[PDB]
Design a protein around this ligand. Structure first.
Ligand SMILES: [Ca+2]
Ligand SMILES: [Ca+2]
Length: 109
């Protein structure tokens, strides 16, 4: 489960900051949930959870469910939030996010 990687305390606080539609701030979210200070291996484990079908990429549909990846009862991102986040993490141009792109996105501040 995600609490095997991050504290429930930090997850509830991070999720709690973005309960409104179109409120997602990825830099703020990753910092609050505590994964910015995790090892590159733990970040990869977080990536595996988010990459729902395990094909190696977080596509847009999986991305919309990112919050649920940390907390099951979380909302889905709005279509606008998903498109904006994908633009932010997809830097090699294929419309999805791979593990190296994910570590780069999380490393931002
Ligand atoms: Ca996938
Ligand atoms: Ca990509």
């Amino acid at each position: 489960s995600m609490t095997d990687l991050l504290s429930a305390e930090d997850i509830k606080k991070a999720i709690g900051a973005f309960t409104a539609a179109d409120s997602f701030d990825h830099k703020k979210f990753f910092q609050m949930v505590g994964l910015k200070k995790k090892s590159a291996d733990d970040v990869k484990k977080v990536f595996h959870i988010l990459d729902k079908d395990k094909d190696g990429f977080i596509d847009e549909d999986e991305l919309g469910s990112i919050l649920k990846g940390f907390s099951s009862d979380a909302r889905d991102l709005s279509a606008k939030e998903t498109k904006t986040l994908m633009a932010a993490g997809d830097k090699d141009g294929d419309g999805k996010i791979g593990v190296e792109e994910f570590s780069t996105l999380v490393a931002e501040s």
